[PDB]
Design a protein around this ligand. Structure first.
Ligand SMILES: Nc1ncnc2c1ncn2[C@@H]1O[C@H](COP(=O)(O)OP(=O)(O)O)[C@@H](O)[C@H]1O
Ligand SMILES: Nc1ncnc2c1ncn2[C@@H]1O[C@H](COP(=O)(O)OP(=O)(O)O)[C@@H](O)[C@H]1O
Ligand SMILES: Nc1ncnc2c1ncn2[C@@H]1O[C@H](COP(=O)(O)OP(=O)(O)O)[C@@H](O)[C@H]1O
Ligand SMILES: [Mg+2]
Ligand SMILES: [Mg+2]
Ligand SMILES: [Mg+2]
Lengths: 528, 532, 52, 172, 535
């Protein structure tokens, strides 16, 4: 290569082409997969990441760990992207997708090094993934009875399986029942914003509770608030979006008077406007008043005089949850405060929870929202508990959409690997090697489970392969018993769509990585 | 807690770094394997340019930092020293073995089991090679040597001219042949003086039926051609005599200074007279010769060469029958030089080779000697021809000493892989994986050859493995053991019939050295790097 | 031991007592060997070389 | 403000890693400072690591000289090249002052530097040779000037001749 | 063991994966576990010296040079400037214990440190940390059940406050106020009981005002069944003492009314100016007359007032105070039984509060005055006024009283108690050891390590009191086993008896349960972490 006084690209452009860059891309993918490798399974371990500001994030979630990793490698970013995709569409399996993709790339690396054309590998991956998805859909177990008790049990088992890998796995039955109960009360859309999650420092995990209603923190009470009663036995709730305090009528309003009588009339008119709003609220029959906009001290004292509870500056989502639980309507004008626009709950009370004051709306019979109040010894403890409960909630929602379950613990992947190997034994032979490599790479998850648990991976792998070969579909890794067992009878259940999405995303990532032959990096502009 | 002033790596990290270093060293030279391989250019920091295909030279010239890479480089150097050929295959095999063993270790297989499996696989591979894949060279004749030389000179700058270079190599090696005690025919390579001189094409390279000196006559008055040469080899300088440290000249009678000064040079004069009186014509000395002694040789019409290399002088004395004399002292305390210490040659000439002159001692008697004058386009080309020629000479020496050869082109590797993957099922429970990985690693050679040839490596190696499996299973298909790779056409081919051979010692030593290097690297699981 | 509130001198004497008892136990466990028994010497050498 | 007997005690042995790292860095700068101080003040009044380990290495019996330059430098460089062609045994080399980072006075008033090293010590420190040598004198003049002080050392093959210890044995 | 992984590819090409990967660090697995256990052990060993009545204080200096002397573990760890992440986790654990309970913020740190120290030697023997965490959780459940079993109930009646006084004294014994120990405990008990929703409901700490002033003595600390305000009468010539005062709480400054809306008043002639001046004067006279007509004796405002209003208030025999804070206004309204009125026109007689005595308090040669309101009818709000020889002991007394109030609040929430001095934890360790003998062998090691970690607090108490830890703890445990009495603890005060029931060392069951639970969860988290990626 010559200096060539006039150059084609910008000076400093870096270009990598050929087999070596593909091998380097595969190695980078393996490096990324290693960073979340040990977080998989009930024996998985958490990872702690410190940012530049010094904040520490402790998480067992693969997607969160990958997000906190500041990857810059163009090929490595695909694994993070597919982890984000799996989190978005499913919510669980973010650790499995990266491992599967990296194992695919590792298995096909020797064939790449020996000059195999990438298109053949891509076609083999597409065929194998299609066959595996069809097999998963075919052998997935579903019950067409719509029995409430067994469907509830299926939801609870799926929640426990999705939860039995986190720091709350000791109380996995308790939190699983809480999560299933919370999800069942969502109405039709299962919107995540309808499940409030409040984290309160202090207290054990068993002290965490689910509220059949809405609960939120106290919001900067004004003077005279402590004179209000803090418990009602059948209150009517006025959900408002109104600023109840003395203020200018309008920002651009101007008052022009030339008589002291008019001055007194103006001040009395302002006071009368405020008192008329408060009087309308009072004769609306409501005992609890909530508002997005601030509620002034004058209004607070007025409500205290009438023995009512008031709370201004309530967050928008909390008022939405209160409206959907008590069954009222958020009002921007108080002129027509009819009976139907007033919320209603059986019991309202303010109670102290770990050094904080919380307002409780319990006893709602037709509530369509929830409120998780999580307790723990550190803010990261509550954060990880919230992440785990989010995973469980997503799993339960997906199970509600379609109750198609497959046994976990790597049993499904053993069945898929056996089926794929059997299929590959009946083709010419160029695709046979690649499909066999795909089937072998499908064994990564149970092997990783055994490695994390401290087992001997080879013996468990051999036993699982022998068990699946001669008959047996749901035989996977049993962590506690140091051996293998029928995971379906052990209630290690997984929605089939989770593994379907995992396989699809891993295959797409592997094909995209393999299809790239050259990498070009333009010099950075405005480095600052 | 350790409080050790240095960096520490433990577990998977250090193993992965070692394997990466070995794989990098392998990938450095993987592009110069087989006849379709291509040479590399090495440029120093001062602009010196080296063009070579030899793996050992490439690894020696490079700067290497990682200890495992150093291990591989020294492995290549040892393979070159002990065999002379296969310096790239040994490195590639060792790196592949290390990679597969590390993969097994990552599969939670204990490294001791992998090491035991590698040892068993190496022993069984050596046994199988010695029992099945060897070809006796007694019934093949000179064609076996010619084919071995041609195979060794493939992938070199003198590949296409092999039809002529192999003849040259075989003739030289057979010329320097000698027998020792207990009747073992020994071939002392490095006795063939390889002389380089740019100019006319390679086909004009000359094989001298004698010896060649890279030096000229001391004086321009001496004749530059003597027919009946009586070579006198000396190991002492011929100049003005000077007393030793313990001897001092103190003059009290001034009349004796002239006699002292005359005797000072007359001693050397009379030594030269004694040497010439016996009929000597060519005088070679390792020391220097001053002006008056050169004139003394001029007046007698005799050659005189100074600053002759010690090894060259020893070779000339051995070939011509002369004996080197470090001093002219007999067993009765006198100065003498008998005619018995004179070697003889058919002709000694100072030939001109591309604006430079060298001395050709042609057709020495009582012993046959050979030398090669290599003609190339420039200096780098001549150096590469010299390296390839040395490799070919070493290969021919190995073939002549040990009369067993094996087919080339990856046939041995494929047969060994099939046999080892069949044999691994017989012994052990965890060692079987190690033996299977050894068999798989042995397949890196044909794969690299096919990749260099830009052929379908997967299909070609699959066909080779199928052929060798059929040979091993069917007992009436033993003729398929020789099925190698035809890199020109990208098809399997009977390499034994095609004339592609190589010494069995090359494969045996490569396997043993690669296995030992892989075992040595595999024991490492912790690194401490103290700061300087 | 130190965290429990034991002076680091009673620990030394107790360790001396334990060392003496252990030396007695090891001597009791030992078995006589003769240099003329090549098998025992070969076994000892092999055991020494096994870890390398 | 008391306790003058600090007796830092465990401190130095507990933070010895950073102390030794700083000591190593300071010593690494120290060899460079010692090497550069041999030129400044000592003779001026009357990569750097490459230079350092080039001076440290090689045999003490071979005279090695270095030249300090900034971009008649070209004429002296040509004369030095001619001497190198005439004295193959010597290892003439040059290095920029900015790479060494010498003093500003040396850069501004001592551009032509003829530094000669023999076994790690300065047997010759010819600096600012403009006055006593000239501006356009040829290579022979420089050779004679350097040989007058007894500092510089006192056939042709075709191209090359060099290539087990068994040379040749005809013994039966 | 650092700087991540550096490869730079096997082809010599650049290999960059994570931004600034050369400037980042990483620890894997067992090394990270050892480092975290060592950090937690160091923090726990620093804290353990301040445990018990003989525990010593820590003198904390902030970044601005302000120095605080304290014994509260949460306060110490909050002000500590740590950088290790596990140290931050321990600080957060102590803060969580403080928030949930208010007492035992030092016990949690020591217990977690002991648990991790035992987990270290379990890990050295080849046990998965998840197994250690599971065993710790099982042993914690067993210990909590045993605590519930051996718990005892006390009466929380207002008529008899002896058990509450004993519990507050046990809480305050470790603090510097142990000189006024009984008086301080009585003050805390009365303060909590006076303001508390009787039906086992919450205790609102915002209705308890804790304000301290330098000077005087610690014994001068008293509980005021009213509100004390650092303001004073506006006019210097009004009387400093009002008896049977009828309070008039107002939030309207005694100034002419001002519309909130942007307004302009136009004066167009001389008669307009005269009308404006007369209107201002009549507004002042009218607000004063409206205040006086209700029969009030003292008027309290929040936004201050000007000279004319001040002189009219003085002239009409109406003492007044201005610029009273919002929380102070609310407290005065609650205590005096009077309502908060936003303007004079809405001020009536029924909205007037009543105070038995309103007085202005001087503080020696300091020129600083302070108003006190007390002798209310049924004051539902109380204030604690702390005096001391320096501000440092004032802050320490403040936090000690906060601890006592929190303990009495916990007693209000739940009346079950256990006997401290290490007796409860020794009994829990015995129960855990008995349970371990029946479980399979693999979890036996974790459960016995949990028991050993539980037994460190009695050892710390014995060591702080100068006694031999191991001998005393062994003797107490043997006595507990022989005679069935889970009340036998460590005689820290050398009273001659080991029975904590006679010594009246009483701890809330909720506090011990929270301690054990929080320590177990934090230890589980610390064990589960096996990777650090600091920059
Ligand atoms: N009780 C169990 N026994 C064996 N394996 C389990 C059990 N519970 C979950 N698993 C396995 O753990 C894996 C999920 O691990 P986790 O990290 O929680 O989520 P992700 O799917 O994102 O990795 C699943 O593949 C499942 O097979
Ligand atoms: N004409 C040929 N046809 C097929 N294979 C060959 C031929 N010549 C050499 N080979 C094979 O190519 C391989 C590489 O040899 P080469 O790399 O040149 O030797 P070295 O390893 O000493 O550099 C040898 O193992 C040999 O078997
Ligand atoms: N009079 C006493 N006799 C024996 N032990 C006591 C006595 N008073 C307190 N203790 C013990 O001292 C320990 C430490 O209590 P303290 O320092 O007040 O709060 P913390 O538990 O936050 O350290 C308690 O566990 C308690 O059992
Ligand atoms: Mg999961
Ligand atoms: Mg070769
Ligand atoms: Mg306490």
């Amino acid at each position: 290569m010559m200096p060539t006084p006039v150059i084609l690209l910008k000076e400093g452009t870096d270009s990598s082409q050929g087999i070596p860059q593909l091998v380097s891309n595969i190695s980078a993918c393996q490096v990324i997969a290693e960073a979340v490798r040990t977080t998989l399974g009930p024996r998985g371990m958490d990872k702690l990441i410190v940012d530049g500001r010094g904040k520490a994030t402790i998480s067992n979630d693969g997607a969160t760990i990958l997000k906190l990793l500041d990857v810059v490698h163009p090929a490595a970013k695909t694994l993070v992207d597919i982890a984000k995709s799996q989190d978005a569409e499913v919510g669980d399996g973010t650790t499995s997708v990266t491992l599967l993709a990296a194992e695919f790339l590792k298995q096909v690396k020797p064939y790449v090094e020996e000059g195999l054309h990438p298109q053949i590998i891509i076609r083999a991956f597409r065929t194998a993934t299609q066959l595996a998805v069809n097999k998963i859909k075919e052998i997935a177990v579903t019950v067409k009875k719509a029995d409430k008790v067994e469907q509830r049990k299926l939801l609870e088992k799926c929640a426990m399986t999705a939860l039995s890998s986190k720091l709350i796995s000791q109380q996995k039955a308790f939190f699983a029942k809480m999560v299933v109960d919370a999800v069942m009360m969502l109405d039709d859309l299962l919107q995540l914003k309808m499940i409030g999650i409040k984290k309160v420092q202090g207290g054990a995990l068993e002290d965490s509770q689910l509220v059949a209603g809405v609960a939120f923190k106290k919001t900067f009470s004004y003077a005279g608030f402590e004179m209000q009663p803090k418990k009602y036995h059948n209150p009517k709730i006025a959900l408002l979006n109104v600023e109840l305090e003395l203020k200018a009528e309008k920002d651009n309003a101007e008052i022009r008077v030339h008589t002291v009588e008019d001055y007194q009339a103006i001040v009395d008119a302002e006071w009368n406007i405020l008192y008329d709003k408060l009087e309308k609220i009072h004769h609306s029959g409501a005992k609890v008043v909530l508002s997005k906009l601030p509620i002034g001290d004058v209004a607070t004292q007025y409500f205290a005089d009438r023995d009512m509870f008031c709370a201004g500056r309530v967050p928008e989502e909390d008022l939405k949850r209160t409206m959907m639980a008590c069954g009222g309507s958020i009002q921007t004008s108080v002129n027509a405060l009819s009976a139907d626009v007033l919320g209603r709950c059986q019991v309202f009370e303010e109670t102290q929870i770990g050094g904080e004051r919380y307002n409780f709306f319990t006893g709602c019979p037709k509530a369509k929202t929830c409120t998780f109040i999580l307790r723990g010894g550190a803010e990261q403890f509550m954060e990880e508990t919230e992440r785990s409960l989010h995973d469980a909630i997503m799993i339960v929602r997906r199970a509600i959409k379609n109750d198609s379950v497959v046994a976990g613990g790597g049993a499904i992947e053993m069945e898929l690997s056996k089926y794929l190997r059997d299929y590959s034994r009946t083709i010419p032979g160029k695709q046979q090697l690649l499909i066999g490599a795909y089937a072998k790479a499908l064994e990564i998850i149970p092997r990783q489970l055994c490695d994390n648990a401290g087992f001997d991976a080879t013996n468990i792998l051999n036993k699982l392969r022998a068990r699946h070969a001669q008959g047996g579909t749901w035989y996977g890794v049993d962590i506690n018993n140091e051996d293998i067992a029928d995971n379906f009878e052990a209630f290690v259940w997984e929605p089939a769509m989770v593994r379907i999405n995992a396989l699809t995303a891993a295959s797409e990532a592997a094909c995209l990585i393999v299809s790239v032959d050259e990498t070009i990096k333009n010099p950075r502009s405005t480095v600052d | 807690p350790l409080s050790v002033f240095g960096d520490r790596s433990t577990g998977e990290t250090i193993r992965s770094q070692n394997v990466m270093a070995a794989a990098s060293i392998a990938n450095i030279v993987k592009s110069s394997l087989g006849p379709v391989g291509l040479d590399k250019m090495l440029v120093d920091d001062i602009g010196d340019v080296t063009i070579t295909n030899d793996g050992a030279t490439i690894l020696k010239l490079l700067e290497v930092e990682h200890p495992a890479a150093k291990v591989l480089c020294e492995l290549a150097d040892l393979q070159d020293k002990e065999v002379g050929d296969g310096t790239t295959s040994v490195v590639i095999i060792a790196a592949e073995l290390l990679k597969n063993a590390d993969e097994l270790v990552k599969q939670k297989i204990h490294p001791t089991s992998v090491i035991s499996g590698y040892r068993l696989a190496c022993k069984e591979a050596v046994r199988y090679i010695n029992e099945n894949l060897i070809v006796n060279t007694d019934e093949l004749g000179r064609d076996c040597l010619i084919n071995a030389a041609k195979t060794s000179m493939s992938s070199k700058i003198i590949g296409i001219n092999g039809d002529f270079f192999a003849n040259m190599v075989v003739d030289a090696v057979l010329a320097i042949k000698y027998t020792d005690i207990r009747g073992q025919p020994r071939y002392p390579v490095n006795s063939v003086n390889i002389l380089k001189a740019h100019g006319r094409s390679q086909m004009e390279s000359m094989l001298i039926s004698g010896y060649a000196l890279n030096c000229v006559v001391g004086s321009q008055g001496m004749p530059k051609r003597i027919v009946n040469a009586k070579i006198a080899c000396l190991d002492f300088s011929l100049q003005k005599t000077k007393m030793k440290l313990g001897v001092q000249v103190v003059i009290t009678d001034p009349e004796k200074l002239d006699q002292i000064r005359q005797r000072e040079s007359d001693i050397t004069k009379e030594r030269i007279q004694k040497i010439l009186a016996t009929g000597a014509n060519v005088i070679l000395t390792t020391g220097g010769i001053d002006d008056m002694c050169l004139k003394y040789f001029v007046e007698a019409g005799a050659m005189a060469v100074r600053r002759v290399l010690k090894r060259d002088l020893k070779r000339i004395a051995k070939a011509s029958g002369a004996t080197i004399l470090s001093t002219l002292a007999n067993l009765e305390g006198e100065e003498t030089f008998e005619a018995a210490m004179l070697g003889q040659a058919e002709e000694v000439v100072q030939e001109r080779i591309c604006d430079d002159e060298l001395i050709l001692i042609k057709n020495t008697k009582a012993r046959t000697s050979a030398s090669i004058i290599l003609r190339g386009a420039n200096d780098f080309m001549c150096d590469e021809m010299e390296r390839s020629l040395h490799d070919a000479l070493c290969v021919v020496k190995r073939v002549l000493e040990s009369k067993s050869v094996v087919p080339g082109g990856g046939a041995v590797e494929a047969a060994l892989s099939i046999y080892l993957e069949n044999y691994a099922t017989s012994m052990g429970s965890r060692e079987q994986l190690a033996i299977a990985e050894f068999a798989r690693s042995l397949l890196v050679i044909p794969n690299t050859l096919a990749v260099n040839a830009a052929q379908d490596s997967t299909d070609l190696v699959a066909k080779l493995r199928a052929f060798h499996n059929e040979a091993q299973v069917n007992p009436e298909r033993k003729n398929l053991k020789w099925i190698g790779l035809d890199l020109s056409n990208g098809k399997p081919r009977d390499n034994k019939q095609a004339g592609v051979f190589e010494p069995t010692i090359v494969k045996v030593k490569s396997l043993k050295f690669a296995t030992e290097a892989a075992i040595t690297i595999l024991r490492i699981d912790d690194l401490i790097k103290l700061h300087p | 031991l130190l965290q429990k509130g034991i002076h680091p001198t009673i620990i030394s004497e107790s360790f001396q007592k334990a060392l003496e008892k252990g030396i007695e136990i090891l001597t009791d466990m030992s078995r006589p060997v003769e240099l003329s028994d090549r098998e025992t010497l070969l076994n000892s050498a092999t055991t020494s070389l096994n870890s390398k | 403000l008391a306790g003058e007997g600090i007796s830092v005690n465990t401190g130095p042995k507990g933070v010895i890693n950073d102390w030794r790292r700083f000591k190593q860095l300071e010593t690494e700068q120290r060899e460079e400072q010692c090497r550069e101080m041999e030129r400044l003040i000592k003779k001026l009044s009357m990569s750097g690591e490459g230079f350092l380990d080039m001076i440290d290495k090689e045999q003490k019996s071979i005279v090695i000289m270095v030249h300090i330059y900034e971009d008649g430098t070209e004429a002296m460089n040509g004369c030095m090249i001619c001497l190198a062609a005439e004295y193959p045994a010597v290892k003439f080399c040059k290095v920029k002052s900015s790479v060494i980072g010498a003093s500003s006075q040396f850069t501004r008033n001592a551009l032509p530097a003829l530094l000669i090293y023999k076994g790690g010590e300065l047997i010759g420190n010819f600096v600012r040779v403009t006055d006593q040598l000239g501006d356009d004198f040829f290579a022979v003049d420089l050779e004679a000037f350097l040989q007058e002080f007894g500092l510089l050392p006192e056939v042709l093959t075709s191209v090359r001749n060099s290539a087990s210890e068994d040379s040749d044995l005809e013994i039966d | 063991a650092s700087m991540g992984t550096l490869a730079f590819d096997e082809y010599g090409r650049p290999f960059l994966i994570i931004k600034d990967q050369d400037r980042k660090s990483r620890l894997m697995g067992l090394e990270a576990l050892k480092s975290h256990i060592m950090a937690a052990k160091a923090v726990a060993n620093t804290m353990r010296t301040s445990l018990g009545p003989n525990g010593l204080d820590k003198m904390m200096v902030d970044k601005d040079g302000d120095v605080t002397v304290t014994n509260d573990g949460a306060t110490i760890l909050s002000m500590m400037d740590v950088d290790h992440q596990i140290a931050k986790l321990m600080v957060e654990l102590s803060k969580s214990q403080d928030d949930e309970i208010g007492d035992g913020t030092t016990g949690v740190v020591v217990l977690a440190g002991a648990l991790l120290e035992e987990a270290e030697q379990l890990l050295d023997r080849g046990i998965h940390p998840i197994r250690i965490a599971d065993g710790y959780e099982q042993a914690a459940r067993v210990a909590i059940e045993h605590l519930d079993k051996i718990s005892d109930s006390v009466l929380v009646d207002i008529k008899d406050t002896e058990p509450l006084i004993q519990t507050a004294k046990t809480t305050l014994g470790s603090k510097v106020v142990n000189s006024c120990h009984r008086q301080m405990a009585e003050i805390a008990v009365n303060a909590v009981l006076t303001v508390a929703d009787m039906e086992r409901r919450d205790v609102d700490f915002e209705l308890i005002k804790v304000e301290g002033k330098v000077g005087g003595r610690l014994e001068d600390t008293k509980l005021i069944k009213g509100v004390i305000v650092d303001k004073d009468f506006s006019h210097p010539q009004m009387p400093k003492k009002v008896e049977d005062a009828k309070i008039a709480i107002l939030t309207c400054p005694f100034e002419p009314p001002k519309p909130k809306t942007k307004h302009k008043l136009d004066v167009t002639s001389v008669e307009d100016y005269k009308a404006l001046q007369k209107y201002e004067k009549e507004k002042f006279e009218e607000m004063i007359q409206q205040i006086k007509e209700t029969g009030a004796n003292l008027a309290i405002c929040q936004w201050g007032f000007d000279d004319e209003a001040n002189h009219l208030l003085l002239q009409n025999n109406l003492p007044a105070v201005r610029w009273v804070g919002g929380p102070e206004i609310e407290l005065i309204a609650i205590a005096t039984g009077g309502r908060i009125v936003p303007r004079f026109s809405e001020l009536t007689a029924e909205k007037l509060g009543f105070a038995g005595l309103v007085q202005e308090i001087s503080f020696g040669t300091t020129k600083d005055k302070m108003l006190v309101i007390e002798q209310c009818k049924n004051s539902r709000a109380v204030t604690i006024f702390i005096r001391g020889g320096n501000k440092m002991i004032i802050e320490e007394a403040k936090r000690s009283l906060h601890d006592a109030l929190c303990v009495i609040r916990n007693l209000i929430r739940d009346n079950r108690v256990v006997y401290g001095g290490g007796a409860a934890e020794i009994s829990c360790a015995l129960a855990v050891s008995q349970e371990a003998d029946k479980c399979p062998t693999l979890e036996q090691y974790a459960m016995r390590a949990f028991a050993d970690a539980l037994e460190v607090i009695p050892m710390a108490l014995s060591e702080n009191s100068g006694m031999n830890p191991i001998q005393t703890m062994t003797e107490v445990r043997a006595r507990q086993v022989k005679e069935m009495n889970p009340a036998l603890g460590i005689d820290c005060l050398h009273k001659g008896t080991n029975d904590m029931k006679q010594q009246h060392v009483i701890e809330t069951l909720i506090g011990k349960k929270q301690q054990i639970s929080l320590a177990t969860q934090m230890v589980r988290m610390i064990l589960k972490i096996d990777d650090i990626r600091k920059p």
